Amino acid sequence: SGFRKMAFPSGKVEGCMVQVTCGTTTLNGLWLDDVVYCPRHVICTSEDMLNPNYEDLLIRKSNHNFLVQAGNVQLRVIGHSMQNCVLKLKVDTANPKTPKYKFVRIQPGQTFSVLACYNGSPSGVYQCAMRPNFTIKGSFLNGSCGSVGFNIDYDCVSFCYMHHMELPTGVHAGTDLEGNFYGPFVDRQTAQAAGTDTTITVNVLAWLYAAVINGDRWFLNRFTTTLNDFNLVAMKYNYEPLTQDHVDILGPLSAQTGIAVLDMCASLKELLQNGMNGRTILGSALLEDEFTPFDVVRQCSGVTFQ
Amino acid sequence: SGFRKMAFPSGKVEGCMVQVTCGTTTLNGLWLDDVVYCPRHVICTSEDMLNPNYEDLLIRKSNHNFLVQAGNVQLRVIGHSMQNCVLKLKVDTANPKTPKYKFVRIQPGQTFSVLACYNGSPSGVYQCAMRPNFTIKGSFLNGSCGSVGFNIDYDCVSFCYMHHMELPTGVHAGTDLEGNFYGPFVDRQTAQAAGTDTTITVNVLAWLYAAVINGDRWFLNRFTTTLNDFNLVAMKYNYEPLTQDHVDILGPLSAQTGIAVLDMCASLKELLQNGMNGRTILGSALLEDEFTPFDVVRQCSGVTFQ
Ligand SMILES: CCOc1cc2ncc(C#N)c(Nc3ccc(F)c(Cl)c3)c2cc1NC(=O)/C=C/CN(C)C
Ligand SMILES: CCOc1cc2ncc(C#N)c(Nc3ccc(F)c(Cl)c3)c2cc1NC(=O)/C=C/CN(C)C
C-alpha cells in the first residue's frame, strides 16, 4: 500500500555520467560505448548564447579542446561531430559500465526519471513528465545541462531527454538523444514562451485508479458520462481531450478495480466542477497528472529492474 | 530553478541489495562487507506472525536454511545471529560494491530516500520523512520488506531505515540498521495504531523559503509574529511547536532570502488560518513538510555525491 512519485533506480545511468568542459563552460555528458553525448552549447560563451552560429563556433574547436572526465580519470577525445543540438565526442575507451540502452523520443504525456548532475556528478533523481506544451517541470541549476531523463524496462535504459535550457518562467526545455528539441524551443537565449500547460487527462484517471486501489475512494459517485460529454468539461478546464485510445489504455486498471472508465470519468468531472472541498487524494490536494497508466500498474505490482 | 521531491542517486545502494529466502518467505537483504542484514520475520510463516517467539523459531534454523542470492550468484552463509529485530547473516565473501557507510538512527522530522526492492531487485526510489508519530508514508508491497532508507553525504551512505511492517491504515513501520523499531511498533501482526500525524513545522518553513527562492511569493505578507504567538496557532492545526533551535537551523535560508524567520512564520500563520484560496505553492495545493532545511539548501545549491 501507498503510492509515491517514484523514479527508476539511477545506478545504470550514474555510471554513464561524465564532465565535459570546452574552454570556460562545464556541463555534463552521457558516456555510452565510445561516445560522449552533450549539449552543443558547451562551445558557447554566455555572450554567444544570444545569437550563436554553432557551425562557425565549432570550426575553432579541435578534439583536444573538449575535456572529458569520468570521475577522476580523463578520457581521450579522438573525434567530434554535431548532430542537431548535441555533440558526439568519440573517445578511445568504451564505457565499461555501459548498460543495455536505446534512444527514444517520447510523446507528450509520457513520464521519465531525471538524474540531475553537476560537474559529471549525480545530485538527485526525480520523476517528470513531458508536458503537452513540450516543456518539463524539473529542478535544474546552472551546470545541470546534459543531465538526462530515462525509463528502464528490465535491463534496458531508454534515454529520452537531455537538458538544455531554462525558460524565463522557470520551466525546462531539452532534446532527445538525437539532439532534436522537444517542442519549438531553440538553444539560444531569446524570447521563447511556453504554450498552454494542459493537464494530461489519461494520467489523472490512472491516478484516480491508483487512489481507489490504495483505499482513497471518497470521490467515487453514482454517475456516469460519455466521451463527448466528458470532453466538454475537459475543454473548459484545459484538460486534454479523452480518446478511445486512452480508454483502451485504462482497460487493465478498469478490470482490476471493476470501475468502468466512463464511471471514473464522471468522478473526475465532479472533481473538476466542484473541487476537492478541502479533502485529499493520495496525499495531494490537486489532481495529479504525472503518473501514466503504466506507472500505476508498475508501482502497484512491484516490477523490478537490473 | 524548479523544486522537486528529489531522492539521492541510488546506485551505491543498488549494489548492496540481495534476496533472502528462509523456507517459504522471500524478502530483501542489505549486503555490506561480509554481513547481510534483513528483517528477522523472514523466519516466520504468515501463521507465525500473529504471536511469534523469534528466539524459539530461530532455534530450528541453521546457516544453510538462509538462501542468499546477489543477482544470479548464491552467497555462502557461514553464521547468523539476531540483533533486536534484524538478522545478521555472515557470508564468506565481502560485497565488492560495499560503499563507505554508516548506520544512523534518525530523528522524527528528518528525511531520507527509500530504494523499494522486490526479490533483491530494485523497483524505484522515492523520498520519505520519519513522521512525528514514527511511521513513514511509503510505497511498499508484499516482498518489499528489507528495503532500506538512506542519506548520502559526498561518498558515504548513512543507512537509517529498514522496512518491516504495514499498519492496517496503510502507513509503514520499520527499524534502524541495529534492528530497533522507530516508535512503539513491533514485528507482529497485532492491533497497533499510529498516533497523531503532526506536521513538521520547521520543514514547512524551509519549503516556503524554497518557494520564495523559486519565485512563488504570493503568500508573503506585511505581518510578523513571535514564537509563542505562532505556537498557539501551530497547536490548533496539529503542527509541531517551533523552538529556537528550529529558528537557528533556518538561519541560512533567512540570510539568503532576507526574510526573517518570524516574518515567514507570520506567512505560515495566515496560510493556516486562511488556507490557500485555490492557489498553489511550488505546484502543491497543501503545505509540504517533507523537505528539511538541509534538503532545501542542498537542492537549491547543486550538491553532488559519488
Ligand atoms: C510485489 C509482489 O507482487 C505483486 C504485488 C501486487 N500487489 C498488488 C497488486 C494490486 N492491486 C498487484 N497487481 C496489480 C494488478 C493489476 C493492476 F491493475 C494493478 Cl494497479 C496492480 C500486484 C502484482 C504483483 N506482481 C505481479 O503482478 C507479477 C506478475 C508477473 N508475471 C508476468 C509473471
Ligand atoms: C549548481 C551550481 O552551483 C550552485 C548554484 C546555486 N544556485 C542557486 C543558489 C541559490 N539561491 C545557490 N546557493 C544557495 C545558497 C544559499 C541558500 F540558502 C540556498 Cl537555498 C542556495 C547555488 C549554489 C551553488 N553551489 C554552491 O553553493 C557551492 C559551494 C561549495 N563551497 C563549500 C566550496
XYZ file of C-alpha atoms and ligand atoms in Angstrom:
678
model
C 0.000 0.000 0.000
C 0.978 3.571 -0.505
C 1.527 5.459 -3.726
C 4.527 7.760 -4.194
C 6.076 9.758 -7.005
C 8.749 7.156 -7.731
C 11.764 7.355 -10.024
C 13.643 4.479 -11.556
C 16.782 3.315 -9.761
C 19.535 5.507 -11.148
C 22.696 3.388 -10.860
C 22.740 2.304 -14.506
C 22.727 5.976 -15.528
C 25.114 7.207 -12.806
C 27.769 5.017 -14.412
C 27.401 6.926 -17.689
C 27.739 10.481 -16.393
C 30.862 12.472 -17.200
C 32.002 16.075 -17.088
C 32.586 17.980 -20.342
C 34.474 21.286 -20.382
C 35.031 23.376 -23.501
C 37.012 26.488 -22.758
C 35.160 28.246 -19.966
C 31.965 26.166 -19.897
C 31.473 22.942 -17.914
C 28.343 20.775 -18.161
C 27.558 17.074 -18.057
C 27.843 14.401 -20.790
C 26.486 10.885 -21.291
C 29.119 8.197 -21.981
C 27.751 5.168 -23.849
C 30.115 2.757 -25.568
C 32.854 5.017 -27.034
C 30.697 8.143 -27.496
C 30.012 11.034 -25.124
C 26.821 12.998 -25.864
C 26.369 16.542 -24.575
C 24.612 19.821 -25.432
C 26.245 21.700 -28.278
C 26.059 24.927 -26.263
C 29.098 23.696 -24.302
C 31.022 25.569 -27.028
C 29.350 28.908 -26.302
C 30.266 31.761 -24.020
C 27.336 33.378 -22.244
C 27.925 36.177 -24.748
C 27.494 33.678 -27.596
C 24.085 32.433 -26.433
C 22.076 35.419 -27.616
C 22.606 34.579 -31.305
C 25.070 31.699 -31.770
C 26.210 30.301 -35.116
C 27.123 26.857 -33.874
C 28.711 25.711 -37.131
C 31.031 28.727 -37.063
C 31.805 28.378 -33.348
C 32.641 24.719 -33.838
C 35.217 25.465 -36.551
C 37.515 26.877 -33.858
C 37.287 23.716 -31.714
C 39.507 20.637 -32.034
C 39.295 17.271 -30.290
C 41.788 18.428 -27.633
C 39.542 21.378 -26.696
C 36.858 19.021 -25.297
C 37.991 17.998 -21.826
C 36.073 14.887 -20.781
C 36.485 13.459 -17.289
C 34.822 10.368 -15.827
C 35.177 10.660 -12.089
C 38.889 11.319 -11.550
C 40.050 9.900 -14.920
C 40.439 11.834 -18.151
C 39.112 10.427 -21.420
C 40.944 10.857 -24.727
C 38.809 12.518 -27.421
C 39.541 11.085 -30.890
C 36.743 12.774 -32.860
C 33.759 15.058 -32.594
C 30.672 15.943 -34.580
C 27.461 17.916 -34.218
C 24.087 16.178 -34.630
C 21.208 18.668 -34.412
C 21.620 20.249 -30.953
C 24.023 17.692 -29.459
C 27.698 16.985 -29.836
C 29.017 13.437 -30.109
C 32.563 13.178 -28.768
C 34.256 9.948 -29.827
C 36.622 8.729 -27.109
C 39.231 5.981 -27.279
C 37.706 3.863 -24.480
C 34.291 2.257 -24.357
C 32.493 2.904 -21.102
C 32.852 -0.387 -19.144
C 29.612 0.499 -17.308
C 27.562 0.953 -20.485
C 24.144 -0.622 -19.857
C 21.866 -2.035 -22.487
C 20.224 1.070 -23.901
C 18.109 2.690 -26.565
C 17.331 6.239 -27.609
C 13.612 7.036 -27.628
C 11.717 10.225 -28.497
C 8.795 10.263 -26.072
C 5.328 11.609 -26.660
C 3.750 14.386 -24.599
C 2.087 12.887 -21.556
C 4.738 10.228 -21.014
C 6.848 10.223 -17.862
C 10.520 9.630 -17.150
C 13.136 9.904 -14.416
C 15.773 12.659 -14.381
C 19.222 12.220 -12.852
C 20.219 15.782 -12.076
C 24.002 16.143 -12.225
C 26.644 18.831 -11.757
C 30.234 18.524 -12.965
C 29.505 14.988 -14.085
C 28.424 14.004 -10.545
C 24.919 12.913 -9.560
C 22.916 15.153 -7.259
C 19.475 13.546 -7.187
C 16.761 11.699 -9.012
C 13.137 12.688 -9.565
C 10.224 11.908 -11.847
C 8.976 14.229 -14.639
C 6.507 14.236 -17.448
C 6.811 15.641 -20.952
C 4.089 18.284 -20.742
C 1.607 18.847 -23.610
C 3.379 22.127 -24.365
C 6.718 20.223 -24.639
C 8.291 21.692 -21.506
C 9.157 19.737 -18.369
C 8.830 20.956 -14.801
C 12.225 19.933 -13.465
C 14.765 21.116 -10.914
C 17.846 22.329 -12.716
C 20.518 24.855 -11.772
C 23.396 26.276 -13.762
C 25.713 23.390 -14.589
C 22.928 20.806 -14.874
C 22.809 20.895 -18.664
C 23.453 17.485 -20.137
C 21.602 15.745 -17.341
C 19.345 13.116 -18.852
C 15.906 11.637 -18.498
C 15.219 7.964 -18.997
C 12.980 4.973 -18.416
C 14.069 1.423 -17.627
C 12.454 -1.828 -18.713
C 14.072 -4.851 -17.102
C 17.723 -4.340 -18.064
C 17.425 -1.744 -20.841
C 17.722 2.011 -20.296
C 15.682 4.073 -22.776
C 17.133 7.576 -22.785
C 14.574 10.160 -23.864
C 15.719 13.595 -22.658
C 18.838 15.706 -22.372
C 18.546 19.008 -20.528
C 19.482 22.205 -22.380
C 17.561 25.338 -21.363
C 15.527 27.102 -18.681
C 12.837 29.454 -19.919
C 12.325 32.784 -18.125
C 9.194 31.329 -16.484
C 11.143 28.601 -14.668
C 10.217 25.556 -16.754
C 12.660 23.488 -18.773
C 13.381 22.537 -22.367
C 15.651 19.943 -23.891
C 16.261 17.441 -26.635
C 16.091 13.765 -27.313
C 19.424 11.943 -27.585
C 19.492 12.680 -31.322
C 19.630 16.359 -30.369
C 16.182 17.411 -31.581
C 14.375 19.695 -29.152
C 11.018 18.680 -27.831
C 8.569 21.312 -28.971
C 9.526 24.553 -30.743
C 12.375 25.529 -28.425
C 15.859 26.507 -29.552
C 19.260 26.657 -27.875
C 19.538 30.429 -27.866
C 18.728 32.886 -25.128
C 15.753 34.558 -26.760
C 12.064 35.300 -26.321
C 10.548 31.839 -26.341
C 7.434 31.310 -24.238
C 5.608 28.116 -23.344
C 2.098 27.460 -24.585
C -0.868 26.369 -22.507
C 0.043 23.870 -19.761
C -2.745 21.411 -20.484
C -3.487 18.680 -17.942
C -2.863 15.078 -19.034
C -6.352 13.631 -18.612
C -5.478 9.959 -19.062
C -2.834 10.262 -16.337
C -5.265 11.883 -13.912
C -7.645 8.968 -14.466
C -4.857 6.473 -13.916
C -4.011 8.166 -10.603
C -7.666 8.036 -9.532
C -7.496 4.268 -10.155
C -4.290 4.196 -8.061
C -6.168 6.029 -5.309
C -9.024 3.514 -5.309
C -6.574 0.592 -5.172
C -4.974 2.233 -2.115
C -8.231 2.932 -0.271
C -8.910 6.581 -1.171
C -12.449 6.310 -2.547
C -14.466 9.309 -1.306
C -14.626 10.812 -4.867
C -16.498 7.832 -6.347
C -20.076 8.759 -7.116
C -23.312 7.446 -8.572
C -22.809 8.943 -12.038
C -21.522 8.065 -15.469
C -20.796 10.088 -18.595
C -19.813 9.733 -22.260
C -16.588 10.605 -24.020
C -18.214 13.594 -25.717
C -19.906 14.872 -22.565
C -16.757 14.484 -20.509
C -14.701 16.293 -23.156
C -16.988 19.326 -22.975
C -15.816 19.539 -19.358
C -12.203 18.674 -20.151
C -12.121 21.601 -22.577
C -13.392 24.139 -20.039
C -10.675 23.087 -17.545
C -7.832 22.923 -20.068
C -7.609 19.135 -19.955
C -6.526 17.143 -22.999
C -9.460 15.542 -24.851
C -10.002 11.915 -23.890
C -9.988 9.481 -26.805
C -10.961 5.872 -27.180
C -7.243 5.054 -27.315
C -6.962 6.448 -23.777
C -9.995 4.462 -22.654
C -8.392 1.299 -24.031
C -5.088 2.006 -22.238
C -7.056 2.288 -18.969
C -8.606 -1.154 -19.594
C -6.329 -3.070 -17.220
C -6.926 -0.647 -14.325
C -10.646 -0.749 -15.044
C -10.585 -4.553 -14.896
C -8.596 -4.675 -11.652
C -10.908 -2.279 -9.810
C -14.194 -3.107 -11.515
C -14.798 0.611 -12.146
C -15.750 1.379 -15.745
C -13.563 4.046 -17.330
C -16.558 6.274 -18.044
C -17.723 5.988 -14.442
C -14.279 7.193 -13.351
C -14.596 9.991 -15.897
C -17.816 11.011 -14.139
C -15.919 11.143 -10.833
C -13.267 13.327 -12.460
C -15.959 15.574 -13.938
C -17.445 16.181 -10.482
C -13.981 16.863 -9.047
C -13.331 19.432 -11.797
C -16.692 21.139 -11.324
C -16.792 21.026 -7.517
C -13.162 20.915 -6.494
C -11.941 18.812 -3.611
C -13.730 20.706 -0.797
C -10.601 20.639 1.351
C -10.080 16.867 1.064
C -7.055 14.998 -0.295
C -6.408 12.092 -2.676
C -3.211 10.075 -2.162
C -1.885 12.921 -0.051
C -2.473 15.551 -2.770
C -4.904 18.486 -2.722
C -4.831 18.748 -6.534
C -5.419 16.296 -9.373
C -2.051 14.685 -10.184
C -1.232 14.157 -13.862
C 2.356 12.857 -13.910
C 1.606 9.143 -13.430
C 0.846 7.192 -16.590
C -1.404 4.115 -16.643
C 1.767 2.036 -16.960
C 3.343 3.820 -13.987
C 0.306 2.980 -11.850
C 0.298 -0.697 -12.832
C 4.080 -0.910 -12.359
C 4.148 0.677 -8.913
C 1.061 -1.202 -7.766
C 2.601 -4.511 -8.963
C 6.243 -4.335 -7.827
C 8.016 -4.596 -11.163
C 11.830 -4.665 -10.826
C 14.930 -3.937 -12.995
C 18.854 -4.608 -13.133
C 15.035 26.917 -10.919
C 12.387 24.438 -10.022
C 11.932 22.487 -6.823
C 11.099 18.770 -6.864
C 10.768 15.977 -4.338
C 14.225 14.570 -5.050
C 15.828 11.353 -3.840
C 19.506 10.596 -3.611
C 21.060 8.692 -6.508
C 20.527 5.048 -5.642
C 23.408 3.217 -7.348
C 25.534 2.883 -4.211
C 22.614 1.128 -2.500
C 21.501 -0.935 -5.521
C 24.867 -2.682 -5.327
C 24.093 -3.844 -1.782
C 20.665 -5.379 -2.354
C 20.254 -9.143 -2.183
C 17.439 -11.651 -1.902
C 16.993 -13.645 1.320
C 14.749 -16.719 1.443
C 14.087 -18.741 4.587
C 11.799 -21.652 3.916
C 8.717 -20.185 2.282
C 9.415 -16.472 2.798
C 11.459 -14.263 0.451
C 12.355 -10.636 1.222
C 15.313 -8.355 0.608
C 18.634 -8.040 2.495
C 21.421 -5.458 2.661
C 24.929 -6.785 1.910
C 27.715 -4.682 3.445
C 31.210 -6.102 3.790
C 30.638 -9.778 4.748
C 27.274 -9.295 6.506
C 23.733 -9.425 5.124
C 21.121 -7.595 7.226
C 17.430 -8.429 6.909
C 14.195 -8.446 8.936
C 14.009 -11.271 11.443
C 10.460 -12.056 10.305
C 11.987 -13.809 7.273
C 11.869 -16.863 9.574
C 8.111 -16.652 10.122
C 5.192 -18.196 8.310
C 2.180 -15.929 7.928
C 0.710 -18.151 10.639
C 3.665 -17.303 12.895
C 3.205 -13.527 12.640
C 0.244 -13.265 14.988
C 2.337 -14.140 18.062
C 5.886 -15.190 17.116
C 8.576 -16.296 19.564
C 11.538 -15.386 17.413
C 14.134 -16.975 19.688
C 12.263 -20.284 19.515
C 11.666 -20.051 15.759
C 15.339 -19.340 15.191
C 16.440 -22.489 17.042
C 15.144 -24.556 14.113
C 17.175 -22.574 11.547
C 20.767 -23.294 10.503
C 23.109 -21.322 8.259
C 22.118 -23.460 5.250
C 18.436 -22.534 5.704
C 19.135 -18.880 4.770
C 19.334 -18.728 0.987
C 21.077 -15.502 -0.017
C 21.376 -14.539 -3.676
C 23.058 -11.461 -5.143
C 21.741 -11.124 -8.655
C 22.285 -14.566 -10.193
C 25.009 -15.686 -7.734
C 24.462 -17.517 -4.466
C 26.274 -16.426 -1.310
C 27.581 -18.908 1.260
C 26.223 -18.287 4.773
C 28.841 -19.043 7.457
C 26.998 -17.699 10.515
C 23.857 -15.978 11.687
C 22.627 -14.042 14.685
C 19.651 -11.969 15.774
C 20.137 -8.343 16.864
C 16.866 -6.813 18.089
C 14.521 -7.131 15.083
C 17.142 -7.858 12.411
C 19.168 -10.878 11.450
C 22.845 -10.595 10.551
C 23.887 -13.336 8.133
C 27.662 -13.680 7.910
C 28.703 -14.689 4.393
C 32.091 -15.861 3.155
C 32.541 -13.041 0.609
C 32.726 -9.323 1.244
C 30.498 -7.338 -1.067
C 32.906 -5.856 -3.674
C 30.412 -2.994 -4.164
C 30.301 -2.035 -0.481
C 30.298 1.776 -0.306
C 31.582 3.839 2.557
C 28.717 3.681 5.028
C 27.393 4.309 8.499
C 24.322 3.277 10.446
C 22.326 6.216 11.806
C 19.127 6.357 13.870
C 17.306 9.419 12.557
C 15.094 11.786 14.477
C 11.441 12.428 13.644
C 11.220 15.159 11.042
C 14.320 14.059 9.152
C 14.063 12.853 5.565
C 15.642 10.012 3.621
C 15.449 8.155 0.318
C 13.929 4.669 0.022
C 15.036 2.130 -2.575
C 11.997 -0.097 -2.873
C 13.046 -3.618 -3.857
C 11.449 -6.989 -4.571
C 13.357 -10.275 -4.652
C 16.575 -8.367 -4.116
C 15.945 -6.265 -7.255
C 15.372 -2.507 -7.283
C 11.969 -1.213 -8.317
C 12.162 2.517 -7.626
C 13.421 5.315 -5.460
C 11.459 7.979 -3.597
C 11.852 10.406 -0.723
C 10.253 9.946 2.737
C 10.273 11.540 6.121
C 10.249 9.951 9.558
C 6.902 11.277 10.772
C 6.446 12.635 14.329
C 4.410 9.526 15.147
C 7.343 7.331 13.949
C 5.605 5.970 10.855
C 6.638 6.682 7.272
C 4.320 7.194 4.325
C 5.984 4.909 1.802
C 5.021 2.695 -1.119
C 5.596 -0.909 -0.175
C 4.003 -4.140 -1.372
C 4.384 -7.691 -0.147
C 8.001 -8.684 -0.711
C 9.397 -5.193 -0.101
C 10.477 -5.910 3.464
C 14.175 -5.338 3.919
C 14.178 -2.391 1.556
C 16.188 0.400 3.125
C 16.180 4.133 3.579
C 19.338 6.191 3.499
C 21.010 9.553 3.051
C 24.271 10.258 1.241
C 26.918 12.834 2.085
C 29.639 13.021 -0.544
C 30.768 9.385 -0.703
C 29.254 7.974 2.499
C 25.873 6.235 2.678
C 24.127 6.648 6.045
C 21.547 3.883 6.320
C 18.716 4.823 8.663
C 15.704 2.608 7.895
C 14.840 -0.977 7.080
C 11.243 -1.737 6.149
C 9.336 -4.299 8.228
C 5.580 -3.721 8.543
C 2.465 -2.118 7.069
C -0.157 -0.998 9.553
C -3.841 -1.585 8.743
C -4.169 2.132 7.914
C -1.658 1.944 5.051
C 1.365 3.618 6.645
C 4.681 1.921 7.314
C 6.909 0.945 10.216
C 10.472 -0.275 10.371
C 13.760 -0.322 12.201
C 17.158 1.245 12.122
C 20.014 -0.980 10.941
C 20.570 -2.125 14.533
C 17.072 -3.607 14.367
C 15.324 -1.262 16.799
C 11.909 -0.133 15.595
C 11.215 3.531 15.224
C 8.399 4.340 17.599
C 6.435 1.758 19.607
C 5.836 -0.688 16.761
C 6.547 -4.409 16.904
C 7.070 -7.125 14.306
C 3.838 -8.965 14.991
C 0.522 -8.725 13.220
C -1.475 -7.146 16.019
C -3.557 -4.116 16.934
C -1.027 -1.318 16.716
C -2.314 2.088 15.646
C -0.417 5.236 14.735
C -0.671 8.352 16.859
C -1.402 11.861 15.648
C 0.251 12.683 12.301
C 1.676 16.034 13.344
C 3.021 18.371 10.660
C 6.761 19.119 10.728
C 6.685 22.896 11.143
C 10.372 23.587 10.523
C 10.165 21.691 7.226
C 7.120 23.651 6.085
C 9.034 26.869 6.749
C 12.035 25.580 4.840
C 9.788 24.803 1.856
C 8.288 28.303 1.995
C 11.868 29.620 1.738
C 12.388 27.256 -1.230
C 9.244 28.705 -2.804
C 10.466 32.289 -2.420
C 13.854 31.394 -3.928
C 11.998 29.921 -6.924
C 9.661 32.879 -7.456
C 6.491 31.747 -5.653
C 5.929 34.698 -3.315
C 2.187 35.464 -3.205
C 1.933 34.231 0.454
C 4.376 36.839 1.800
C 2.552 39.442 3.836
C 3.042 42.552 5.936
C 2.994 40.757 9.295
C 5.303 39.284 11.883
C 4.762 37.140 14.965
C 6.578 35.665 17.974
C 7.493 32.087 18.762
C 4.826 31.904 21.466
C 2.110 33.508 19.348
C 2.901 31.320 16.368
C 2.861 28.193 18.542
C -0.670 28.964 19.726
C -1.594 28.588 16.051
C 0.682 25.604 15.462
C -1.104 23.790 18.288
C -4.589 24.361 16.866
C -3.501 22.926 13.479
C -1.566 19.966 14.881
C 1.817 21.397 13.922
C 4.916 20.655 15.985
C 5.889 23.538 18.297
C 8.595 25.751 16.829
C 11.670 26.165 19.019
C 14.631 28.474 18.928
C 16.693 25.513 17.707
C 14.443 25.407 14.631
C 14.780 29.156 14.140
C 18.565 28.796 14.253
C 18.528 25.954 11.693
C 16.557 28.247 9.349
C 19.249 30.942 9.706
C 20.983 30.236 6.391
C 17.722 30.335 4.401
C 16.740 33.511 6.223
C 20.070 35.098 5.279
C 19.845 34.066 1.622
C 16.341 35.472 1.144
C 16.464 38.369 3.591
C 13.174 37.196 5.136
C 13.303 36.967 8.927
C 12.216 33.580 10.255
C 9.431 35.131 12.325
C 8.137 37.025 9.300
C 7.932 33.703 7.449
C 6.158 32.271 10.485
C 3.578 35.043 10.088
C 3.077 33.998 6.454
C 2.593 30.397 7.572
C 0.138 31.515 10.258
C -2.010 33.283 7.654
C -1.856 30.236 5.371
C -3.025 28.006 8.242
C -5.853 30.346 9.221
C -6.994 31.269 5.706
C -5.952 28.326 3.586
C -4.584 28.737 0.096
C -7.769 30.094 -1.551
C -7.297 27.808 -4.544
C -3.698 28.886 -5.223
C -0.563 26.728 -5.309
C 2.980 26.895 -3.911
C 5.712 25.035 -5.816
C 2.997 23.098 -7.601
C 1.333 21.940 -4.354
C -2.120 22.851 -3.022
C -1.119 21.888 0.539
C 1.736 22.857 2.845
C 4.590 20.400 2.197
C 6.506 19.141 5.234
C 8.921 16.517 3.873
C 11.782 18.850 2.898
C 14.238 19.693 5.660
C 16.183 22.969 5.784
C 19.224 20.987 4.644
C 17.261 19.457 1.763
C 16.264 22.933 0.572
C 19.815 24.294 0.722
C 21.174 21.146 -0.957
C 18.707 21.127 -3.840
C 18.924 24.883 -4.313
C 22.759 24.678 -4.378
C 23.515 21.626 -6.546
C 25.421 19.482 -4.072
C 26.706 16.218 -5.606
C 27.833 12.726 -4.428
C 29.839 9.521 -5.681
C 5.169 -7.192 -5.238
C 4.534 -8.513 -5.138
O 3.993 -8.805 -6.435
C 2.849 -8.146 -6.809
C 2.093 -7.499 -5.862
C 0.898 -6.841 -6.204
N 0.218 -6.238 -5.199
C -0.878 -5.619 -5.512
C -1.426 -5.609 -6.839
C -2.668 -4.891 -6.842
N -3.669 -4.354 -6.763
C -0.708 -6.187 -7.889
N -1.123 -6.235 -9.155
C -1.831 -5.360 -9.918
C -2.575 -5.922 -10.948
C -3.319 -5.123 -11.797
C -3.312 -3.777 -11.597
F -4.013 -3.032 -12.453
C -2.542 -3.190 -10.608
Cl -2.509 -1.490 -10.346
C -1.785 -3.976 -9.758
C 0.481 -6.856 -7.547
C 1.276 -7.550 -8.508
C 2.445 -8.168 -8.158
N 3.170 -8.875 -9.164
C 2.797 -9.166 -10.444
O 1.765 -8.703 -10.928
C 3.708 -10.070 -11.233
C 3.468 -10.709 -12.416
C 4.495 -11.293 -13.408
N 4.061 -12.274 -14.471
C 4.106 -11.719 -15.818
C 4.845 -13.500 -14.466
C 24.842 24.319 -9.193
C 25.753 25.459 -9.358
O 26.232 25.791 -8.047
C 25.370 26.444 -7.202
C 24.236 27.033 -7.705
C 23.346 27.737 -6.875
N 22.259 28.290 -7.465
C 21.429 28.929 -6.700
C 21.649 29.134 -5.296
C 20.583 29.925 -4.752
N 19.735 30.596 -4.397
C 22.742 28.528 -4.671
N 23.040 28.653 -3.378
C 22.262 28.749 -2.266
C 22.824 29.430 -1.193
C 22.129 29.572 -0.007
C 20.880 29.037 0.084
F 20.249 29.163 1.252
C 20.318 28.314 -0.954
Cl 18.748 27.619 -0.855
C 21.007 28.155 -2.142
C 23.638 27.834 -5.502
C 24.833 27.228 -5.009
C 25.675 26.530 -5.830
N 26.870 25.982 -5.274
C 27.401 26.169 -4.031
O 26.786 26.784 -3.161
C 28.767 25.585 -3.777
C 29.621 25.823 -2.738
C 30.809 24.960 -2.265
N 31.859 25.537 -1.347
C 31.811 24.984 0.001
C 33.212 25.366 -1.853
